Amino acid sequence: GVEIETISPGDGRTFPKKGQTCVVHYTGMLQNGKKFDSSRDRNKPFKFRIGKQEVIKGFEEGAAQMSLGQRAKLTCTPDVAYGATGHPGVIPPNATLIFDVELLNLE
Numbered sequence: 001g002v003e004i005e006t007i008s009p010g011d012g013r014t015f016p017k018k019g020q021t022c023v024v025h026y027t028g029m030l031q032n033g034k035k036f037d038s039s040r041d042r043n044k045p046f047k048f049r050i051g052k053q054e055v056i057k058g059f060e061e062g063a064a065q066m067s068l069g070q071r072a073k074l075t076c077t078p079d080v081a082y083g084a085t086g087h088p089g090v091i092p093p094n095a096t097l098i099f100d101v102e103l104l105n106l107e
Helices: 057-064
Strands: 021-023 027-030 047-049 071-076 097-102
Antiparallel strands (some): 027 097
């Protein structure tokens, strides 16, 4: 389950493909909670590739459903990233994660 609410401006066609190192200014958020992880804070806009399962499935499936310039809004289900496990100190178990994802990518 990936619920995408794209803020419209972009190009609508430059989709991430397999092995494409793509760039996302992500900004994390917890449902009824604050931020937990931000490439905007680091100003290091997370050059990641598609097809290696580096990112979680809630963040990976949201990337291919966007295009260049688009600004979507992830609502990541718990069971795809940390629902039973939970990260120690960052992500609790059974958290519905929120992301400000804008696909301003490369390749």
